[PDB]
Amino acid sequence: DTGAAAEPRAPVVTIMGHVDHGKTSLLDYIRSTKVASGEAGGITQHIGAYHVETENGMITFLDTPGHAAFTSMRARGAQATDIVVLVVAADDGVMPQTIEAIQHAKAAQVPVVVAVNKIDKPEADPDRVKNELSQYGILPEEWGGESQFVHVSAKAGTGIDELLDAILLQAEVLELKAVRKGMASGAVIESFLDKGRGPVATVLVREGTLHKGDIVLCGFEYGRVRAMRNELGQEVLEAGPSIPVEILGLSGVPAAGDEVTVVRDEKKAREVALYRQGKFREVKLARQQKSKLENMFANMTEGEVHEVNIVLKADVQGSVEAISDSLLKLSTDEVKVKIIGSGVGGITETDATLAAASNAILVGFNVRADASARKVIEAESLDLRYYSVIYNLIDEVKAAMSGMLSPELKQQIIGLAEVRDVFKSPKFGAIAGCMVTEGVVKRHNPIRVLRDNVVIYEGELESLRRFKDDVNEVRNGMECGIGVKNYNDVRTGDVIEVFEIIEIQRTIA
Template identity: 35%
Template sequence: MSYKEKKINRPPIITVAGHIDHGKTTFLNYIRKIKNPLKEDGGITQHLNAYNVETKYGNMTFIDTPGHSAFNVIRIKSIQNSDIMLLIISIDDGIKQQTIESINIAKEYNIPIIVCINKIDKAELENKKEKIINELSKIGLLQELWGGDTFFTYISAKTGEGIENLIDTINTQAELLDLKSNFDGLANGIILDNKMDNKQGLITSIIIKNGKLKKGDLIKTQTDYGKIKLILNEEKLINEAIPSMYVNIIGLKKNQEIGCTFECFKKEKNTKKQIQPTKIDLTEKKNKYSIEDLIKQMTSNKVKNLNIIIKADVQGSINVLKDTINNIITEKIKINIIKIDIGNPIKSDIDLAITTKSVILCFKTKNSQQINKLIQNNGIILKTFALIHELIFYITERIKDESIEEKKEILIGTAEIKKIFTQDKNVIAGCSIIQGKIKQNSIIKIFRKNTMIHKGSISSIKIFKNQVNEVTQGNECGISIKDYNLIQIHDKIKSYIQE
């Protein structure tokens, strides 16, 4: 790749980091002049976002990182690929775990830090400012007024106080760094994220480091190549982008890892030979199973398995979930990630879940009517979550349930659902007892096409209007199942007792 020798100043790329709920996103909304921002679920940032912000010094690119501990990998990639780290610290909360983690990451990659103490509009907390400054000095961040090399600023992201001075400080730090890039020639840069759009396909988020990115350029990574069809600056279509700009592009076909590089090239001839093959991590390869291996393992009875299929909205979410789940340590249960991918659930996910007896866990995705019908017809467990920590909590609770030493369950009877009706908003299964007996206080399992879809208990058994404790073979009754209504005609209800 060739560039003109002359390099010129480029805008700074700033990662905004800090502990959860310290005001990172509020600050960015203020400088972006967003008066009615859309709030993320739970009121916390769960995605890596980036913005091209126009200031009196020209454009500055800001990367907003999640503050939750689960997103450490994303913070590392963001800070590593930025010029400056802006460390937001809430004056009322002080230095926290993610504050220190962010400092350590910046130091490791030699990224200069600007400390920004936020929420100074809370005048009653003024005395805490000195405490924060002193604590930071003990871990190597000494403000320039004390002879150090770290800029300290003080703002209220809520009122805007001090933000103009902060922008001045960022510009000063950028001038000291003397940031330069080639603005001509073919572009290169880094991948920040991917997401799947139902209409436009794969959207790849990038930051340009050198050159000029143009619509129609050929682009390649280690694992993919394509032609840039669209360039988006937030929601606005543009024809080209220059160094330090954050844009979304459409043109690549495969998900890319956060932090990997891309470059544009001239000729399409022998393109496949130009792409370097992805290096395979052998430690990860050992954890991959064929479907046949999984089924053999599941039927061996030597170990309990929790098979999961994960679907998420963006690649950043995938990285966080994969990293967090792989770090869950359990002796009695083996967690197998059968598939992990971005995008809404599709039919092949349901088919795979049936074959591998997997639970499908979704983060910020949507189900089509077809998928909802397939889930119901096949008795698949599919859970959708708006908060990552709730998804992780669900997995840990499933592990606890599976780890409990089960008492021996003895089948005492089977009923088939012949009719479904409602009474006082309760769903009643009109059943025929085809074997043994169904007892009120027994454990029940509901099967659909030989697949168990629910395990629970009975709320009531009635023959006509009379409440009964059990019904024997050859008789009919109405069964109300506790906290479960997703029954269908021909489902089988099996009754068990423990010993």
């Protein structure tokens, strides 16, 4: 990074909102692709960057879905981009997910331009959007707050001409700083694991430069680049600070995002990469000692000790950190759920072994079973379930938890009976003659023996016998007989209370 060379670049733009403002539609129409609703779920659960060539100059587009679950993706996408776009619908207005995107725009000090998505529907009006978002300091219009609004059809494909112009201008009015040659650096969009290609990452390069021989260092991972891939293009020789290019040949799957810096030699970068691992490992053992010692007692003070374990491996690195945060949101005091051994991709022997030791569900956002993986899963009793969307996953884990509960909320008496004129039996030691005043007496239902309102003894009936009949059930106001083991003293005037036991069941929330 020497020479202080300043060259203009294509602005990187991210788009945020409440789900359903047709945020994806804006991109696909510009891209003339329409990959929307071609994928499972009908919505975009993943992040990607796509550069297009349109007058004037060059521009690239980045998009992140807006959901309660993706706390991290929208936070990282804002700070990386020079310009942020916020989609808003006149029918939808403002929503708590959209205001969440407002904070990401201001805290990242990134200038913002917006577009009205629906001009097609007659019940949709712009004035509603402007005024209601007026209250918030963001999105002023012609009040001297320099922000500009755009009205697009998004289905109609109507300009757009204005939105595009604003974006170009907004990037034009601010000085665009970059360099064509120098020390390469940037951030990682999304990383995942491939079977043939190996571990890969999608990287935005702040300073644009690359070469097959150049050594690159991402986080605590290091390595030489074997090949370069850009979008549909299978191979690219050179990559500029503007257009993003998937990086390949790194040692292992890096963090979901971080700062990446190339180096001259790999040997010099080996010690640095190992140094970052030591710190990350030291804090790992540090946070491990605290959480265990935090209770300051050998066990839990109450009965919440019952827990459920899960095993998760997702193909993409961006999800495992992001959805886990949303997976810890559904956690409750009663039933505690924890993730064990989050994977970078697929499935493996040591992963199936991990679920073998402790009973757990093995789930993946997207995964396929390995040849060696099937043998283990099919042999021992386990469960392999893969889910296209995170919503179907977040629901069933809760379901697993709700079932775990075992609550019986009813201890209603089945019958109440008073005993009189005790008889002697060899087997039980006593038979207390009874007369049921209320309800029906049953065999295996538990009883409460009490005298003078206090309980002298407790137990469960072993034998209910009237005469030589030995019937299993006795109604009220019918002469009845009773005996039980481990009850020594039968006195008249006391009353025995029999009660059935039932379980209400439980739900999670």
